[PDB]
Amino acid sequence: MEIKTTTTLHRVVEETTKPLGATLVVETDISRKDVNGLARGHLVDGIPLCTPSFYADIAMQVGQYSMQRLRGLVDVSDMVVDKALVPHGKGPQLLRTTLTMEWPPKAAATTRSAKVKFATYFLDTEHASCTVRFTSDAQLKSLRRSVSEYKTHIRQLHDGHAKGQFMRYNRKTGYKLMSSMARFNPDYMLLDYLVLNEAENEAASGVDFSLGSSEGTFAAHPAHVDAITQVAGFAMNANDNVDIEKQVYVNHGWDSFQIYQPLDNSKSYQVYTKMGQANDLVHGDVVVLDGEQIVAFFRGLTLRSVPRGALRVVLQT
Amino acid sequence: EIKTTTTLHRVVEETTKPLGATLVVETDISRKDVNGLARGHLVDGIPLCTPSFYADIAMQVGQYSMQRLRAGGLVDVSDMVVDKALVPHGKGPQLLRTTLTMEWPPKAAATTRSAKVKFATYFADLDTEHASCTVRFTSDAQLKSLRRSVSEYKTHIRQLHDGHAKGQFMRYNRKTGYKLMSSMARFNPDYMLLDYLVLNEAENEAASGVDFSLGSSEGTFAAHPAHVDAITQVAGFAMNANDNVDIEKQVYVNHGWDSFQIYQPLDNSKSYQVYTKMGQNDLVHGDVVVLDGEQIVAFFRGLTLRSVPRGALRVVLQT
Ligand SMILES: CCCCCCCCCCCCCCCC(=O)O
Ligand SMILES: CCCCCCCCCCCCCCCC(=O)O
């Protein structure tokens, strides 16, 4: 019955079932040595930051649990990041995840979504929220039919590079290109290579999870998931016309995220995205493949253009 | 005469004698017409004067001394050694004094072919000794040799472009290249003159198009500091842009060079082709050639870069 504790889910604070719904509150001390390093995924202006993928992992966990006890794909949807979470590492820093569900009398078994909120307590700060959904395989089946199409897009990008049309970045050079904006926890530096067609903010990347350490138990390793979103972040910020000393594209959230095959830390995967031009926001889909197999998919991944200076000022505040 | 220019403000001392002579000139790097120019690179928020700044002044005091001791010449800024960083504070006057000294037999001075030059800052009524070099009134032997190798340099350049066209080498557009180096150093906009650069990392070999029309370069000079620094930037980028070089830990910085000659004016409206093969203690060296189509424009022989810890660099500059 009880939910399994993991590297990213440490304790159950509250769990109460009710006739018209239920509530599940879990806790994670992001200062604990087995997870503190992981909670510090990005580094901006010397300030450590927790990535959206961190919340997504916990969401999948409390979602998969809730879905299994009222009765198989869990979609971490409508992800919204409101305030940065800085893992200070000075004693306990409790991140509380609250999941809530509602349903008509004796109809709990048909519930297909739940609201999730993420906030730290010493209330400290409300950081993010999302809606976990127990979705259908309609999208998966659709993606499977488009596999050859994605493969062709990927192939065309490599052919373009082979003709000197698009840039191909080796891992260390790509991270170097982004280094004035942000540095990454070594365990998060999983992009092996990336071919970028700047004209369409379109990229094909090889992500190799064997390039980092990922010990622990998770639903979806935060480093693996963040790596997937990094392909889109790089596609935007690596454009010749984007001056990262003045304006940069940062994570905002996403509309939908589904994983169909476990994210193996010994394997490499192919990631493809065409973000496009796009007010203040840009959005696009990101697909992950393992050869001919559909592994995961972000629908509506959203990035926001913000002043580099303002970003710094806020983080330093 | 010793015409004053944007980088040479006034004569502090000039004494000619039987066994030689001395020429001391002064440059207030805070003056509005040259202050921005003296701030070529920015490392950890600290502005830095580039070696090319000294080279410009050296060419000036050198050309002057040369044309003066003769009844009529290529000036080589050789043995350039940069000892201490020069940080243009912009807090009032900052006097950079250039001292040139010559020596010769009692017979005739018209045969003098070199002069010692030193660069150091002094307060208003010594601050730090920054660099030194030996200006030489050289022959055209090297120029003639370089002209015979033009087709060879052209082929190296062509091969780099052909490699890129096959996906073998990286080609960096101007802004992307500066972005790649931005965590290590930022540049005065007038110094961001590299239009594109094709790099063969295996041999730290690069072919770059430098376009002087990409920056502002108003004023009078012998060799504009931004133009000359841009030439050396091709080699600096070739080294620091290697995938195996982690600029968060180690970086290749300017050290100086053995020889530098300019054969054609460095026109601020033109673009030029720059080629270097730096190849593999803590020092690396190589030659850098500048072409204008089929014409040899300039040449650095023995340009030297030094590998230094990124953090140590920061600590030193902050001090
Ligand atoms: C082969 C390329 C390797 C380099 C990959 C770099 C990934 C860059 C991702 C840019 C987004 C990071 C910006 C941090 C701010 C934020 O999103 O909250
Ligand atoms: C097309 C490429 C454009 C980018 C050109 C970047 C030139 C980088 C040069 C690296 C040397 C700069 C290091 C400063 C420290 C020093 O030399 O004293």
XYZ file of C-alpha atoms and ligand atoms in Angstrom:
672
model
C 0.000 0.000 0.000
C 2.594 2.531 1.189
C 4.526 4.633 -1.342
C 8.200 3.746 -1.796
C 10.742 6.295 -0.583
C 13.492 7.122 -3.071
C 16.483 9.405 -3.635
C 14.029 12.208 -4.424
C 11.113 11.284 -2.117
C 12.139 10.857 1.529
C 9.074 10.899 3.761
C 5.275 10.941 3.862
C 4.082 13.985 5.805
C 0.340 13.519 5.386
C -1.972 11.061 3.652
C -5.716 11.318 4.162
C -8.429 9.661 2.081
C -11.869 11.274 1.917
C -15.246 10.460 0.294
C -14.889 13.249 -2.281
C -11.127 13.093 -2.784
C -7.739 12.594 -1.150
C -4.507 14.363 -0.253
C -0.919 13.131 -0.216
C 1.930 15.222 1.143
C 5.512 13.988 0.836
C 8.837 15.499 1.838
C 12.358 15.639 0.423
C 15.350 17.086 2.255
C 17.358 18.385 -0.692
C 20.360 18.779 1.616
C 20.752 15.020 2.189
C 24.068 13.844 0.713
C 22.510 11.277 -1.597
C 20.387 13.914 -3.341
C 21.943 17.329 -2.619
C 24.327 17.032 -5.543
C 21.433 16.181 -7.859
C 19.284 19.064 -6.645
C 22.014 21.387 -7.919
C 21.612 20.816 -11.656
C 22.454 24.237 -13.084
C 24.714 27.013 -11.835
C 23.965 30.615 -12.822
C 26.238 33.407 -11.619
C 27.628 31.066 -8.971
C 24.135 30.271 -7.699
C 22.973 26.613 -7.675
C 19.511 25.921 -9.070
C 17.095 23.008 -8.910
C 15.798 22.028 -12.366
C 12.136 21.477 -13.370
C 13.044 17.832 -14.013
C 13.565 17.469 -10.257
C 9.896 18.235 -9.601
C 8.873 16.081 -12.566
C 10.571 13.036 -11.041
C 8.657 13.467 -7.776
C 5.427 14.131 -9.696
C 5.792 10.862 -11.600
C 6.349 9.098 -8.289
C 3.349 10.457 -6.391
C 1.297 10.160 -9.570
C 2.184 6.542 -10.347
C 1.462 5.749 -6.701
C -1.910 7.490 -6.578
C -2.946 5.944 -9.898
C -2.028 2.437 -8.754
C -3.833 2.595 -5.404
C -7.202 3.752 -6.750
C -7.298 0.767 -9.095
C -0.702 3.067 -16.921
C 0.962 6.107 -18.464
C 1.500 9.085 -16.180
C 1.776 12.455 -17.917
C 3.455 15.264 -15.962
C 1.371 17.987 -17.580
C 0.848 21.721 -17.206
C 4.235 22.147 -15.525
C 4.672 25.703 -14.286
C 7.826 26.935 -12.557
C 7.086 30.119 -10.594
C 10.142 30.697 -8.415
C 13.704 29.414 -8.450
C 14.748 26.893 -5.819
C 18.321 27.386 -4.605
C 19.749 24.388 -2.686
C 21.770 26.222 -0.022
C 23.031 23.028 1.600
C 23.124 24.625 5.055
C 21.212 22.130 7.143
C 17.768 20.729 6.188
C 15.910 22.306 3.261
C 12.557 20.566 3.030
C 10.818 20.519 -0.344
C 7.190 19.575 0.203
C 5.157 18.018 -2.614
C 1.368 18.116 -2.190
C -0.895 16.012 -4.418
C -4.667 16.384 -4.317
C -7.484 14.509 -6.057
C -11.276 14.781 -6.203
C -14.045 12.509 -7.479
C -17.780 11.678 -7.362
C -18.972 9.176 -4.706
C -17.377 5.719 -5.033
C -15.872 6.741 -8.387
C -12.280 7.222 -7.230
C -11.156 4.447 -9.573
C -11.982 6.602 -12.601
C -10.003 9.668 -11.525
C -7.556 10.522 -14.308
C -5.713 13.584 -12.988
C -4.350 15.112 -9.791
C -3.018 18.531 -8.833
C 0.559 18.751 -7.566
C 2.290 21.667 -5.835
C 5.956 22.060 -4.886
C 7.056 24.374 -2.071
C 9.817 24.546 0.544
C 9.296 24.855 4.309
C 11.802 25.673 7.052
C 6.064 27.941 4.386
C 9.250 29.197 2.745
C 8.529 29.545 -0.975
C 6.084 28.084 -3.507
C 8.176 27.011 -6.482
C 6.142 25.052 -9.012
C 2.983 23.150 -9.863
C 1.754 20.603 -12.385
C -1.151 18.305 -13.097
C -0.350 14.618 -13.300
C -2.617 12.751 -15.703
C -3.291 9.045 -16.173
C -3.467 9.327 -19.947
C -4.310 7.147 -22.945
C -1.819 5.676 -25.408
C -3.287 7.646 -28.301
C -0.276 9.949 -28.450
C 2.167 7.054 -28.155
C 0.502 5.243 -31.064
C 0.587 8.464 -33.093
C 4.270 9.052 -32.328
C 5.077 5.490 -33.356
C 3.560 6.151 -36.772
C 5.730 9.268 -37.159
C 9.013 7.534 -36.285
C 10.273 7.351 -39.875
C 9.451 11.058 -40.233
C 11.498 12.022 -37.164
C 14.327 9.800 -38.393
C 14.291 11.653 -41.708
C 14.470 15.033 -39.983
C 17.426 13.791 -37.951
C 19.105 12.333 -41.031
C 18.640 15.575 -42.975
C 20.299 17.557 -40.205
C 23.340 15.271 -40.313
C 23.427 15.492 -44.113
C 23.318 19.271 -43.823
C 26.271 19.217 -41.458
C 28.144 16.883 -43.811
C 27.804 19.623 -46.436
C 28.886 22.420 -44.108
C 25.357 23.806 -43.734
C 24.698 23.312 -40.012
C 26.825 23.459 -36.866
C 27.724 20.237 -35.055
C 28.837 20.703 -31.469
C 30.890 18.177 -29.543
C 29.843 17.854 -25.888
C 32.513 19.964 -24.185
C 32.426 22.665 -26.864
C 28.652 23.001 -26.547
C 28.808 23.440 -22.788
C 31.680 25.895 -23.279
C 29.437 27.924 -25.612
C 26.832 28.221 -22.845
C 29.301 28.698 -19.963
C 28.938 32.474 -19.575
C 25.199 31.943 -19.024
C 25.232 28.730 -17.018
C 27.436 25.878 -15.932
C 26.184 22.373 -15.302
C 26.517 19.743 -12.611
C 28.799 17.152 -14.280
C 26.054 14.549 -13.865
C 23.873 16.773 -16.048
C 26.417 17.129 -18.894
C 24.913 14.309 -20.923
C 24.649 15.823 -24.410
C 27.215 13.935 -26.510
C 26.746 15.994 -29.680
C 24.199 18.293 -31.264
C 23.607 19.378 -34.859
C 21.808 22.709 -35.061
C 19.920 24.332 -37.916
C 19.782 27.870 -36.529
C 17.274 29.089 -39.119
C 14.561 26.977 -37.509
C 15.990 26.516 -34.002
C 15.986 22.863 -35.015
C 18.287 20.291 -33.434
C 19.168 16.599 -33.446
C 21.265 15.516 -30.485
C 22.802 12.357 -29.132
C 22.340 12.178 -25.371
C 24.446 9.577 -23.595
C 23.431 8.864 -20.011
C 26.630 6.866 -19.442
C 28.481 10.205 -19.488
C 27.377 11.057 -15.966
C 26.825 9.404 -12.599
C 23.240 8.645 -11.613
C 23.227 6.486 -8.499
C 19.996 6.252 -6.545
C 16.350 5.372 -7.084
C 13.987 7.513 -9.173
C 10.905 7.389 -11.395
C 12.739 9.498 -13.989
C 16.274 10.600 -13.135
C 16.359 14.422 -12.936
C 19.628 14.588 -14.871
C 18.290 12.418 -17.703
C 15.103 14.417 -18.077
C 16.868 17.761 -17.837
C 19.293 16.607 -20.551
C 16.342 16.116 -22.876
C 15.156 19.683 -22.299
C 18.729 20.948 -22.685
C 18.568 20.134 -26.386
C 15.819 22.732 -26.803
C 17.518 25.225 -24.490
C 20.750 24.975 -26.474
C 18.922 25.251 -29.801
C 17.557 28.610 -28.646
C 20.589 30.108 -26.888
C 23.169 28.852 -29.391
C 21.656 30.878 -32.243
C 24.215 33.354 -33.615
C 21.629 36.136 -33.247
C 21.104 35.536 -29.526
C 23.534 37.561 -27.374
C 23.564 35.629 -24.095
C 25.299 38.533 -22.397
C 22.021 40.456 -22.762
C 19.085 38.091 -23.327
C 18.691 34.359 -22.673
C 16.043 31.658 -22.989
C 15.210 29.977 -19.700
C 13.001 27.053 -18.721
C 9.391 28.004 -18.079
C 7.625 24.661 -17.993
C 5.730 22.511 -20.492
C 2.264 21.334 -21.473
C 2.872 17.591 -21.441
C 5.664 15.105 -20.701
C 5.389 11.330 -21.126
C 8.005 8.571 -20.818
C 7.308 5.269 -22.586
C 10.566 3.402 -21.991
C 12.797 3.560 -18.896
C 15.650 6.091 -19.149
C 18.586 3.666 -18.874
C 21.816 5.164 -17.464
C 23.939 2.887 -19.661
C 22.294 3.951 -22.927
C 22.457 6.756 -25.477
C 19.347 8.202 -27.140
C 18.465 10.490 -30.036
C 16.646 13.744 -29.275
C 14.973 15.949 -31.867
C 13.202 19.301 -31.607
C 12.135 22.156 -33.882
C 11.409 25.121 -31.612
C 10.788 27.828 -34.194
C 10.578 31.613 -34.010
C 7.640 32.498 -31.711
C 5.919 37.747 -27.550
C 7.984 36.622 -24.544
C 7.689 32.833 -24.958
C 8.732 30.148 -27.448
C 7.382 26.605 -27.498
C 7.959 23.327 -29.270
C 7.938 19.561 -28.984
C 10.893 17.357 -28.104
C 10.999 13.670 -29.007
C 13.377 11.035 -27.647
C 14.139 7.894 -29.631
C 16.110 4.700 -29.050
C 16.746 3.593 -32.601
C 13.252 2.918 -33.960
C 11.628 3.049 -30.505
C 9.743 6.058 -29.095
C 11.173 6.701 -25.616
C 9.682 9.972 -24.387
C 7.991 13.141 -25.613
C 7.626 16.718 -24.408
C 4.671 18.487 -25.974
C 4.722 22.246 -25.691
C 8.063 22.629 -23.910
C 8.167 26.359 -23.164
C 11.176 28.659 -22.849
C 11.045 32.340 -21.863
C 13.277 35.154 -23.102
C 14.610 37.157 -20.164
C 17.287 39.838 -19.724
C 20.590 38.273 -18.629
C 21.108 41.009 -16.054
C 17.622 40.834 -14.554
C 18.046 37.065 -14.265
C 21.247 37.615 -12.294
C 19.729 40.308 -10.073
C 16.723 38.152 -9.171
C 18.855 35.090 -8.404
C 21.210 37.174 -6.260
C 18.142 38.450 -4.403
C 59.144 65.531 -35.789
C 57.725 62.509 -33.935
C 54.136 63.288 -34.908
C 51.830 62.913 -31.914
C 48.973 60.481 -32.475
C 46.033 58.807 -30.744
C 48.495 56.477 -29.003
C 51.506 58.828 -28.618
C 50.682 62.085 -26.826
C 53.926 63.889 -26.038
C 57.715 63.797 -25.949
C 58.999 63.642 -22.382
C 62.687 63.504 -23.274
C 64.924 63.273 -26.335
C 68.693 63.365 -25.969
C 71.069 62.537 -28.815
C 74.740 61.987 -28.011
C 78.011 60.572 -29.439
C 77.490 56.906 -28.532
C 73.713 56.727 -28.929
C 70.423 58.408 -28.077
C 67.298 58.217 -25.940
C 63.674 59.004 -26.725
C 60.974 59.018 -24.070
C 57.351 59.581 -25.062
C 54.143 59.650 -23.050
C 50.558 58.470 -23.507
C 47.713 59.251 -21.115
C 45.561 56.163 -21.628
C 42.690 57.915 -19.844
C 42.251 60.519 -22.611
C 38.800 60.100 -24.184
C 40.159 59.585 -27.683
C 42.284 56.601 -26.616
C 40.781 55.323 -23.339
C 38.228 53.050 -24.969
C 40.937 51.714 -27.265
C 43.311 50.940 -24.396
C 40.601 48.670 -22.985
C 40.865 45.876 -25.549
C 39.996 42.802 -23.483
C 37.875 42.333 -20.378
C 38.701 39.462 -18.007
C 36.527 38.939 -14.934
C 35.244 42.489 -15.340
C 38.771 43.914 -15.404
C 39.800 45.929 -18.499
C 43.174 45.062 -20.021
C 45.522 46.781 -22.443
C 46.598 44.467 -25.273
C 50.181 43.824 -26.498
C 49.148 45.402 -29.799
C 48.814 48.713 -27.950
C 52.532 48.678 -27.170
C 53.322 47.432 -30.675
C 51.613 50.464 -32.225
C 53.706 52.855 -30.134
C 56.834 50.797 -30.864
C 56.284 51.097 -34.614
C 55.915 54.853 -34.151
C 59.049 55.534 -32.113
C 60.857 53.015 -34.305
C 59.875 54.457 -37.691
C 60.746 57.906 -36.344
C 64.189 56.907 -35.090
C 64.944 55.022 -38.316
C 63.964 57.754 -40.786
C 65.776 60.230 -38.533
C 69.271 58.697 -38.481
C 69.359 58.387 -42.268
C 69.554 60.650 -45.314
C 67.007 58.622 -47.257
C 62.328 50.979 -44.256
C 60.640 47.986 -42.650
C 60.257 48.196 -38.877
C 60.010 44.858 -37.065
C 58.527 44.931 -33.550
C 60.602 41.987 -32.338
C 61.258 40.202 -29.051
C 57.982 41.471 -27.586
C 57.742 40.455 -23.940
C 54.700 41.288 -21.806
C 55.587 41.083 -18.100
C 52.723 42.701 -16.187
C 49.102 43.418 -17.023
C 48.152 47.050 -17.593
C 44.672 47.922 -16.332
C 43.250 51.239 -17.620
C 41.433 52.413 -14.480
C 39.988 55.545 -16.059
C 40.307 57.314 -12.697
C 42.134 60.425 -13.827
C 45.422 60.428 -15.802
C 47.330 57.167 -16.255
C 50.663 57.851 -17.928
C 52.231 55.091 -20.007
C 55.818 56.019 -20.797
C 57.656 54.424 -23.704
C 61.449 54.612 -23.588
C 63.533 53.925 -26.695
C 67.308 53.674 -26.515
C 69.976 53.225 -29.180
C 73.756 52.807 -29.286
C 76.379 53.040 -32.029
C 80.103 53.515 -32.807
C 81.424 57.133 -32.791
C 81.768 56.857 -36.572
C 78.165 56.865 -37.814
C 74.678 56.216 -36.447
C 73.046 55.747 -39.844
C 73.977 52.060 -39.600
C 72.004 51.402 -36.407
C 69.503 48.620 -37.137
C 67.802 48.053 -33.774
C 66.668 49.876 -30.648
C 65.491 48.786 -27.210
C 61.993 49.828 -26.114
C 60.372 49.596 -22.683
C 56.802 50.305 -21.577
C 55.944 51.326 -18.020
C 53.303 53.432 -16.271
C 54.180 56.394 -14.053
C 52.120 58.504 -11.652
C 51.659 62.267 -11.967
C 54.846 63.651 -10.405
C 57.279 54.496 -11.534
C 53.964 52.567 -11.257
C 54.753 49.305 -13.029
C 56.951 48.070 -15.874
C 54.649 46.275 -18.294
C 56.509 45.236 -21.422
C 59.558 45.490 -23.641
C 60.583 44.833 -27.222
C 63.358 45.442 -29.699
C 62.440 47.391 -32.808
C 64.525 46.373 -35.815
C 65.087 48.088 -39.153
C 65.039 44.831 -41.076
C 65.621 43.575 -44.621
C 62.973 42.386 -47.075
C 64.368 38.853 -47.153
C 61.410 37.509 -45.191
C 58.910 39.472 -47.274
C 60.317 38.031 -50.502
C 60.233 34.553 -48.961
C 56.616 35.001 -47.857
C 55.634 36.150 -51.335
C 57.017 32.917 -52.788
C 54.862 30.934 -50.346
C 51.582 32.729 -51.058
C 50.125 29.907 -53.161
C 51.083 27.509 -50.356
C 49.226 29.541 -47.729
C 46.278 29.841 -50.117
C 46.170 26.055 -50.427
C 46.206 25.557 -46.655
C 43.313 28.014 -46.387
C 41.424 26.372 -49.245
C 41.869 22.942 -47.661
C 40.425 24.163 -44.379
C 37.329 25.444 -46.180
C 37.030 22.180 -48.114
C 37.246 20.275 -44.845
C 34.423 22.322 -43.371
C 32.368 21.750 -46.528
C 32.630 18.028 -45.753
C 31.763 18.392 -42.072
C 35.325 17.798 -40.876
C 36.204 21.159 -39.292
C 34.273 23.738 -37.270
C 33.379 27.076 -38.862
C 32.495 29.827 -36.406
C 30.468 32.901 -37.282
C 31.709 36.076 -35.548
C 29.211 36.345 -32.690
C 29.207 32.611 -31.987
C 33.003 32.582 -31.770
C 33.066 35.439 -29.274
C 30.250 33.720 -27.390
C 32.400 30.575 -27.118
C 35.158 32.618 -25.449
C 32.875 34.821 -23.305
C 33.387 32.966 -20.017
C 37.131 33.601 -20.385
C 37.164 37.073 -21.908
C 34.899 39.683 -23.418
C 36.048 42.154 -26.043
C 35.827 45.863 -26.701
C 33.372 46.017 -29.646
C 36.048 47.737 -31.733
C 38.159 44.611 -31.236
C 35.489 42.126 -32.385
C 36.795 42.007 -35.938
C 36.893 38.268 -36.676
C 34.169 37.672 -39.283
C 34.515 33.868 -39.411
C 37.069 31.210 -38.514
C 37.485 27.622 -39.713
C 39.342 25.490 -37.179
C 41.127 22.159 -37.550
C 41.466 21.328 -33.855
C 43.863 18.414 -34.387
C 46.590 20.871 -35.405
C 45.310 24.065 -33.731
C 45.163 25.281 -37.321
C 42.866 28.094 -38.431
C 41.878 30.195 -41.443
C 39.932 33.323 -40.561
C 38.431 36.281 -42.336
C 39.054 39.456 -40.361
C 36.976 42.441 -41.411
C 38.163 45.766 -40.016
C 34.962 47.485 -41.168
C 33.208 45.601 -38.346
C 34.528 47.988 -35.718
C 35.211 51.679 -35.214
C 38.833 52.760 -35.527
C 39.014 56.536 -35.632
C 42.245 58.296 -34.762
C 45.844 58.236 -35.955
C 48.165 55.251 -35.513
C 51.087 53.387 -37.061
C 49.164 50.116 -36.684
C 45.714 50.268 -35.097
C 45.775 48.262 -31.834
C 42.415 46.652 -32.606
C 43.528 45.541 -36.078
C 46.748 44.001 -34.808
C 45.091 42.365 -31.807
C 42.495 40.865 -34.167
C 45.301 39.126 -36.024
C 46.620 37.538 -32.823
C 43.062 36.632 -31.813
C 43.004 34.046 -34.588
C 45.789 32.139 -32.820
C 44.319 32.687 -29.354
C 40.981 31.291 -30.518
C 42.645 28.355 -32.271
C 44.131 27.350 -28.917
C 41.243 28.048 -26.530
C 38.499 26.752 -28.831
C 39.916 23.208 -28.818
C 37.348 20.761 -27.425
C 40.015 19.406 -25.070
C 40.741 22.819 -23.532
C 38.528 23.513 -20.495
C 38.587 27.305 -20.214
C 37.063 27.068 -16.744
C 40.388 25.584 -15.596
C 43.136 26.421 -18.105
C 43.485 29.094 -20.774
C 46.066 30.237 -23.300
C 46.995 33.884 -22.884
C 49.155 36.325 -24.841
C 52.826 36.173 -23.921
C 54.486 38.065 -26.749
C 56.202 37.168 -30.024
C 59.576 36.910 -31.717
C 58.853 39.071 -34.756
C 56.070 41.201 -36.242
C 56.209 42.971 -39.601
C 53.536 44.839 -41.561
C 53.994 45.217 -45.328
C 50.715 46.850 -46.352
C 48.555 49.351 -44.442
C 45.858 47.825 -42.219
C 42.897 49.515 -43.924
C 39.824 49.943 -41.697
C 37.533 49.452 -44.710
C 39.026 46.116 -45.807
C 38.770 42.450 -44.866
C 41.829 40.177 -44.797
C 42.614 36.465 -44.621
C 44.536 35.199 -41.597
C 46.139 31.775 -41.322
C 47.997 30.022 -38.498
C 49.041 26.499 -37.516
C 49.980 26.682 -33.839
C 50.322 22.921 -33.455
C 50.937 21.309 -30.068
C 56.558 23.434 -20.942
C 53.641 25.868 -20.610
C 54.268 27.722 -23.882
C 53.067 27.203 -27.455
C 54.267 29.117 -30.490
C 53.558 29.506 -34.169
C 53.437 31.880 -37.103
C 50.483 33.961 -38.273
C 50.222 35.300 -41.813
C 47.845 37.978 -43.074
C 46.879 38.130 -46.734
C 44.880 40.485 -48.949
C 44.009 38.221 -51.844
C 47.402 37.398 -53.349
C 49.257 40.117 -51.398
C 51.267 39.491 -48.211
C 50.038 42.021 -45.635
C 51.668 41.159 -42.315
C 53.420 38.339 -40.483
C 53.943 37.285 -36.883
C 56.880 34.930 -36.458
C 56.937 33.012 -33.216
C 53.700 34.330 -31.709
C 53.738 32.857 -28.200
C 50.830 31.921 -25.942
C 51.097 30.596 -22.384
C 48.880 28.075 -20.621
C 47.766 29.473 -17.263
C 45.218 28.386 -14.649
C 41.920 30.227 -15.145
C 41.528 30.785 -11.415
C 45.125 31.880 -10.910
C 44.550 34.321 -13.762
C 41.523 35.763 -11.968
C 43.345 36.080 -8.642
C 46.285 37.863 -10.281
C 44.115 40.368 -12.155
C 41.943 41.055 -9.104
C 45.144 41.798 -7.188
C 26.326 19.205 -27.468
C 25.865 20.482 -26.761
C 26.207 20.448 -25.269
C 25.768 21.731 -24.539
C 24.336 21.659 -24.016
C 23.962 22.956 -23.298
C 22.495 23.016 -22.884
C 22.051 24.465 -22.720
C 20.661 24.566 -22.104
C 20.252 26.033 -21.959
C 19.284 26.229 -20.796
C 20.023 26.556 -19.499
C 19.606 27.912 -18.937
C 19.425 27.841 -17.424
C 18.275 28.739 -16.960
C 16.983 27.951 -16.827
O 16.542 27.273 -17.782
O 16.338 27.975 -15.759
C 35.165 33.876 -35.530
C 35.689 33.727 -34.097
C 35.448 34.998 -33.280
C 35.948 34.866 -31.831
C 37.402 35.304 -31.657
C 37.832 35.159 -30.196
C 39.318 35.433 -29.973
C 39.802 34.752 -28.698
C 41.254 35.090 -28.394
C 41.708 34.389 -27.113
C 42.733 35.225 -26.356
C 42.063 36.122 -25.317
C 42.556 35.819 -23.906
C 42.826 37.110 -23.139
C 44.034 36.960 -22.214
C 45.309 37.433 -22.892
O 45.616 37.034 -24.039
O 46.074 38.224 -22.306
